[PDB]
Design a protein around this motif. Structure first.
Motif, PDB file in Angstrom:
ATOM      1  N   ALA A  24      14.040  -8.374  45.212  1.00  0.00           N
ATOM      2  CA  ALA A  24      14.196  -6.933  44.984  1.00  0.00           C
ATOM      3  C   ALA A  24      12.897  -5.891  45.132  1.00  0.00           C
ATOM      4  O   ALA A  24      12.932  -4.747  45.855  1.00  0.00           O
ATOM      5  CB  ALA A  24      14.236  -6.738  43.441  1.00  0.00           C
ATOM      6  N   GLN A  25      11.749  -6.536  45.089  1.00  0.00           N
ATOM      7  CA  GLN A  25      10.536  -5.935  45.308  1.00  0.00           C
ATOM      8  C   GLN A  25      10.205  -5.568  46.861  1.00  0.00           C
ATOM      9  O   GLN A  25      10.154  -4.291  47.057  1.00  0.00           O
ATOM     10  CB  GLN A  25       9.304  -6.680  44.796  1.00  0.00           C
ATOM     11  CG  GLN A  25       7.939  -5.538  44.855  1.00  0.00           C
ATOM     12  CD  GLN A  25       7.184  -5.426  46.295  1.00  0.00           C
ATOM     13  OE1 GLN A  25       7.402  -6.545  46.819  1.00  0.00           O
ATOM     14  NE2 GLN A  25       6.837  -4.386  46.351  1.00  0.00           N
ATOM     15  N   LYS A  26      10.474  -6.451  47.495  1.00  0.00           N
ATOM     16  CA  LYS A  26      10.665  -6.099  49.153  1.00  0.00           C
ATOM     17  C   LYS A  26      11.618  -5.146  49.478  1.00  0.00           C
ATOM     18  O   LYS A  26      11.377  -4.442  50.340  1.00  0.00           O
ATOM     19  CB  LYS A  26      10.570  -7.549  49.726  1.00  0.00           C
ATOM     20  CG  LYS A  26       9.488  -8.359  49.683  1.00  0.00           C
ATOM     21  CD  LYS A  26       8.376  -7.826  50.175  1.00  0.00           C
ATOM     22  CE  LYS A  26       6.962  -8.931  50.623  1.00  0.00           C
ATOM     23  NZ  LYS A  26       5.928  -8.525  50.676  1.00  0.00           N
ATOM     24  N   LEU A  27      12.783  -5.411  48.812  1.00  0.00           N
ATOM     25  CA  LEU A  27      14.069  -4.512  49.529  1.00  0.00           C
ATOM     26  C   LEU A  27      13.828  -3.267  48.895  1.00  0.00           C
ATOM     27  O   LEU A  27      14.137  -2.023  49.713  1.00  0.00           O
ATOM     28  CB  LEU A  27      15.276  -5.062  49.063  1.00  0.00           C
ATOM     29  CG  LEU A  27      15.743  -6.418  49.860  1.00  0.00           C
ATOM     30  CD1 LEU A  27      16.831  -7.077  49.052  1.00  0.00           C
ATOM     31  CD2 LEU A  27      15.787  -5.930  51.007  1.00  0.00           C
ATOM     32  N   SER A  85       6.908  -2.631  38.762  1.00  0.00           N
ATOM     33  CA  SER A  85       6.931  -1.897  40.192  1.00  0.00           C
ATOM     34  C   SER A  85       8.288  -1.413  40.767  1.00  0.00           C
ATOM     35  O   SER A  85       8.398  -0.653  41.878  1.00  0.00           O
ATOM     36  CB  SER A  85       6.011  -2.560  41.018  1.00  0.00           C
ATOM     37  OG  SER A  85       6.816  -3.736  41.528  1.00  0.00           O
ATOM     38  N   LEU A  86       9.415  -1.946  40.351  1.00  0.00           N
ATOM     39  CA  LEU A  86      10.708  -1.807  40.909  1.00  0.00           C
ATOM     40  C   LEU A  86      10.983  -0.258  40.440  1.00  0.00           C
ATOM     41  O   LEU A  86      10.684   0.162  39.301  1.00  0.00           O
ATOM     42  CB  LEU A  86      11.679  -2.607  40.233  1.00  0.00           C
ATOM     43  CG  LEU A  86      11.453  -4.224  40.547  1.00  0.00           C
ATOM     44  CD1 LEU A  86      12.651  -5.080  40.247  1.00  0.00           C
ATOM     45  CD2 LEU A  86      11.488  -4.374  42.241  1.00  0.00           C
ATOM     46  N   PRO A  87      12.043   0.586  41.183  1.00  0.00           N
ATOM     47  CA  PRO A  87      12.724   1.711  40.558  1.00  0.00           C
ATOM     48  C   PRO A  87      13.003   1.489  39.152  1.00  0.00           C
ATOM     49  O   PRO A  87      13.904   0.460  38.766  1.00  0.00           O
ATOM     50  CB  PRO A  87      13.654   1.984  41.728  1.00  0.00           C
ATOM     51  CG  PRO A  87      13.109   1.224  42.914  1.00  0.00           C
ATOM     52  CD  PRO A  87      12.645  -0.156  42.355  1.00  0.00           C
ATOM     53  N   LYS A  88      12.755   2.744  38.371  1.00  0.00           N
ATOM     54  CA  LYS A  88      13.353   2.889  37.058  1.00  0.00           C
ATOM     55  C   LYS A  88      14.901   2.117  36.761  1.00  0.00           C
ATOM     56  O   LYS A  88      15.652   2.517  37.523  1.00  0.00           O
ATOM     57  CB  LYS A  88      13.418   4.273  36.829  1.00  0.00           C
ATOM     58  CG  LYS A  88      13.479   4.307  34.978  1.00  0.00           C
ATOM     59  CD  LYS A  88      13.976   5.971  34.741  1.00  0.00           C
ATOM     60  CE  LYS A  88      12.561   6.730  34.936  1.00  0.00           C
ATOM     61  NZ  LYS A  88      13.008   8.118  34.954  1.00  0.00           N
ATOM     62  N   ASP A  89      15.181   1.124  36.002  1.00  0.00           N
ATOM     63  CA  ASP A  89      16.376   0.624  35.647  1.00  0.00           C
ATOM     64  C   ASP A  89      16.932  -0.351  36.622  1.00  0.00           C
ATOM     65  O   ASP A  89      18.094  -0.289  36.740  1.00  0.00           O
ATOM     66  CB  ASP A  89      17.383   1.608  35.058  1.00  0.00           C
ATOM     67  CG  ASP A  89      16.529   2.451  33.907  1.00  0.00           C
ATOM     68  OD1 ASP A  89      15.684   1.827  33.277  1.00  0.00           O
ATOM     69  OD2 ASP A  89      16.798   3.527  33.662  1.00  0.00           O
ATOM     70  N   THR A  90      16.077  -0.724  37.531  1.00  0.00           N
ATOM     71  CA  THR A  90      16.783  -1.998  38.742  1.00  0.00           C
ATOM     72  C   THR A  90      17.246  -2.915  38.015  1.00  0.00           C
ATOM     73  O   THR A  90      18.273  -3.380  38.420  1.00  0.00           O
ATOM     74  CB  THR A  90      15.679  -2.348  39.696  1.00  0.00           C
ATOM     75  OG1 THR A  90      15.151  -1.047  40.227  1.00  0.00           O
ATOM     76  CG2 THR A  90      16.113  -3.250  40.605  1.00  0.00           C
ATOM     77  N   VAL A  91      16.825  -3.553  36.980  1.00  0.00           N
ATOM     78  CA  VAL A  91      16.865  -4.655  36.279  1.00  0.00           C
ATOM     79  C   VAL A  91      17.936  -4.483  35.142  1.00  0.00           C
ATOM     80  O   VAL A  91      17.333  -3.749  34.287  1.00  0.00           O
ATOM     81  CB  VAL A  91      15.876  -5.503  36.126  1.00  0.00           C
ATOM     82  CG1 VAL A  91      16.394  -6.917  35.297  1.00  0.00           C
ATOM     83  CG2 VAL A  91      14.958  -5.887  37.182  1.00  0.00           C
TER      84      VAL A  91
END
Ligand SMILES: Cc1cc2nc3c(=O)[nH]c(=O)nc-3n(C[C@H](O)[C@H](O)[C@H](O)COP(=O)(O)OP(=O)(O)OC[C@H]3O[C@@H](n4cnc5c(N)ncnc54)[C@H](O)[C@@H]3O)c2cc1C
Length: 472
Positions: free
Chosen positions: A17-20, A206-212
Motif C-alpha cells: 500500500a505504501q508504494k502504491l 504514512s498512508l492516506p487517511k483511512d486507507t486501512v
C-alpha cells in the motif's frame, strides 16, 4: 485511479500500500482490529512484549526493516553502530550446570553439520529427503568414533532450537536440498525497544487517511469475471471482493497477503474460481509450523542480573531417538529455554506439536507447569511461582494458523516462486513472507514481497498507454 484492494495489514500489505499510494483508489482490508499481523507488540507487565516477530534478523544496510527502523527513530546507538552491523546459564533437567566447554564442543559439531547442508543445493534426487535425516546420519558417524548420553542430550536442545528457527515440529520435516537457499544478512540481531509494532504503525500512518479498514475479513475473492459496479452507469471490473460482513467490493487488482496457514485451510473457498492447480499444490506442499512465546513475570529475579538466556538440557534425550512426527515425553520438554527480557520477565520459546498442545492448556496450567520445570532445572524446590503469564497462540489464531513458512519435505524453493506467481492480467497478486524464496519467515522478506507486487502493478499501469500506440 485503478481500484486496488490489499487483503491483510501485516508488513507485506502495508509495504505494498505504501508504494502504491505514493494515484489508485486503494483500500487495505484487515481481518483483526489492528495492523501488524505477525508483528504484534503488547503492553504487558507494565512494559512491552513481542507476541510475534522479535528481532531484526541481520540488521545491516541491505535489510529494509533495519533501514526503516533507523529512519523512524526506533533503534538505539548500539543497534545502529558500525560494529553491530558487521557481526547464558545452561541448566540440565537433573538440576546441575552444563560445562561451557562441552556446550561449545557440541555447538561446533551441530552448526558445522548445518553448514554442510549446502552440499545438497540444487540436487534433484537427494539421498536423504530432510535436514533432520542428514544431521542424524552424521551425528551417528561421530558417535561411532567417541558422557555420550550428556553429549546427545545437549545435541537434542540444538535440534529443538533449530525447530524454533525453522518454525517446524521436526528437522525431519524440512527439505534438505532447498535448505541453504535461505539468506542471512550480516549484523547482530536486535530488538526494537518500543515494540516491533511501532514499525508497522509508522508505515500505516504514512498512508492516506483511512486507507486501512479494520475488522473487515474477506470471505472470497471472485476473479476472472466481468462484474458491474453497484452504481449507474455500471462500470465493469474483473474482480469482486466478498467480505465476511456481506460487502461486495469491485476491484481491478487484489493483492493477497494472508498467511500461508490461512490459505492451507481456506483456499478452496477463498477463491472463486479455484486457484490454478500448481499454485493450489504449492500451498499444500509448503511447510507452515508453529513457534510460540511464553512470558512469565516474577516478583523477584532468581537469575543473575547479567544473564540473557536460561538454556535447558533435558537429560537422557537424543535426536537419534526422534522421528519426524514423534513427540517429546511431555510438551514442556520441547521448550529450549528462556530469554531474560531487558520488572522481572522471562520469555520461553517452544515450536512444533508440543507448542500447539501448549495453546490448548489454560494460562494456569502453563504457569504452574513451568514454575515446576524451573524448580527442577535450577535444582531449587523453593523457587517462587511466577506471578503471571502471557503466551502467544499462533496455531489457534483463525487468520494465521501458525507462525511461519518453511520449505517442507516434498516442496522446493520453486514452490515459494509459485506462491508469488500472479493470476492472469494481475487480477490477483500475492505477497507475504511465504512468497519470498530467500527471505521467507522474516519481516524483511514480507516487506520486500509487498514492494515487489506494487512494482509489478505500477509497470502494468505504465504500459496501458502503449495499448493505444499504432505502428504507423
Ligand atoms: C512467534 C513468531 C516469531 C517470529 N520471529 C521473527 C523474528 O524475530 N524476526 C522476523 O524477521 N520475523 C519473525 N517472524 C516472522 C514474521 O513475523 C513474518 O514473516 C511477517 O511478519 C509476516 O508478514 P506478512 O505481511 O507476510 O503476514 P502477516 O503479518 O501475517 O499479515 C497478514 C495479515 O492478513 C490478515 N488476514 C488473514 N486472513 C484475512 C482475511 N480473510 N481477510 C483480511 N485479512 C486477513 C491477518 O490478520 C494479518 O494481519 C516471527 C513470527 C512469529 C509468529
Amino acid at each position: 485511479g485503478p481500484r486496488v484492494l490489499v487483503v491483510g495489514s501485516g508488513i507485506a500489505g502495508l509495504g505494498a500500500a505504501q508504494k502504491l499510494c505514493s494515484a489508485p483508489h486503494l483500500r487495505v482490508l484487515e481481518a483483526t482490529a489492528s495492523a501488524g499481523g505477525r508483528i504484534r507488540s503488547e503492553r504487558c507487565f507494565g512494559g512491552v512484549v513481542e507476541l510475534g516477530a522479535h528481532w531484526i534478523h541481520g540488521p545491516s544496510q541491505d535489510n529494509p526493516v533495519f533501514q526503516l527502523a533507523a529512519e523512524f527513530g526506533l533503534l538505539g546507538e548500539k543497534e545502529l553502530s558500525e560494529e553491530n552491523q558487521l557481526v547464558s546459564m545452561i541448566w540440565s533437567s537433573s538440576g546441575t550446570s552444563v560445562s561451557l566447554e562441552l556446550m561449545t564442543e557440541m555447538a561446533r559439531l551441530f552448526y558445522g553439520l548445518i553448514e554442510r547442508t549446502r552440499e545438497f543445493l540444487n540436487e534433484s534426487e537427494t539421498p536423504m529427503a530432510s535436514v533432520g535425516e542428514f544431521l542424524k546420519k552424521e551425528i551417528s558417524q561421530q558417535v561411532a568414533s567417541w558422557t555420550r548420553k550428556r553429549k546427545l542430550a545437549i545435541l537434542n536442545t540444538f535440534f529443538n532450537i533449530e525447530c524454533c528457527v525453522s518454525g517446524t515440529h521436526s528437522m525431519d520435516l524440512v527439505a534438505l536440498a532447498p535448505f541453504g537457499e535461505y539468506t542471512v544478512l550480516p549484523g547482530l540481531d536486535c530488538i526494537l525497544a518500543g515494540g516491533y509494532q511501532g514499525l508497522t504503525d509508522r508505515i500505516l500512518a504514512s498512508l492516506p487517511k483511512d486507507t486501512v479498514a479494520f475488522d473487515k475479513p474477506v470471505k472470497t475473492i471472485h476473479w476472472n469475471g466481468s462484474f458491474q459496479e453497484a452504481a449507474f452507469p455500471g462500470e465493469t471490473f474483473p474482480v469482486l471482493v466478498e467480505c465476511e460482513d456481506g460487502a461486495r467490493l469491485p476491484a481491478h487488482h487484489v493483492i493477497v497477503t494472508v498467511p500461508l496457514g490461512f490459505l492451507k485451510e481456506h483456499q478452496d473457498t477463498f477463491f472463486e474460481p479455484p486457484l490454478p492447480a500448481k499454485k493450489a499444490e504449492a500451498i499444500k506442499k509448503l511447510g507452515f509450523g508453529t513457534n510460540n512465546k511464553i512470558f512469565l513475570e516474577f516478583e523477584e529475579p532468581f537469575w543473575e542480573p547479567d544473564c540473557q538466556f536460561i538454556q535447558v538440557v533435558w537429560e537422557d534425550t537424543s535426536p537419534l531417538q526422534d522421528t519426524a512426527l514423534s513427540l517429546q515425553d511431555t510438551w514442556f520438554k520441547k521448550l529450549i529455554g528462556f530469554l531474560v527480557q531487558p520488572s522481572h520477565v522471562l520469555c520461553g520459546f517452544i515450536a512444533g506439536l508440543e507448542s500447539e498442545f501448549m495453546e490448548t492448556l489454560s494460562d494456569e496450567e502453563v504457569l504452574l507447569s513451568l514454575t515446576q520445570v524451573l524448580r527442577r532445572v535450577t535444582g531449587n524446590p523453593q523457587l517462587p511461582a511466577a506471578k503471571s503469564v502471557r503466551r502467544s497462540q499462533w496455531h489457534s489464531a483463525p487468520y494465521t494458523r501458525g507462525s511461519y513458512s518453511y520449505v517442507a519435505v516434498g516442496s522446493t524453493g520453486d514452490d515459494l516462486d509459485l506462491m508469488a506467481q500472479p493470476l492472469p492480467g494481475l487480477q490477483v497478486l500475492f505477497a507475504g513472507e511465504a512468497t519470498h524464496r530467500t527471505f521467507y519467515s522474516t519481516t524483511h522478506g514480507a516487506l520486500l514481497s509487498g514492494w515487489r507486487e506494487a512494482d509489478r502493478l505500477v509497470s502494468l499501469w505504465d504500459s496501458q498507454v502503449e495499448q493505444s500506440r499504432p505502428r504507423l
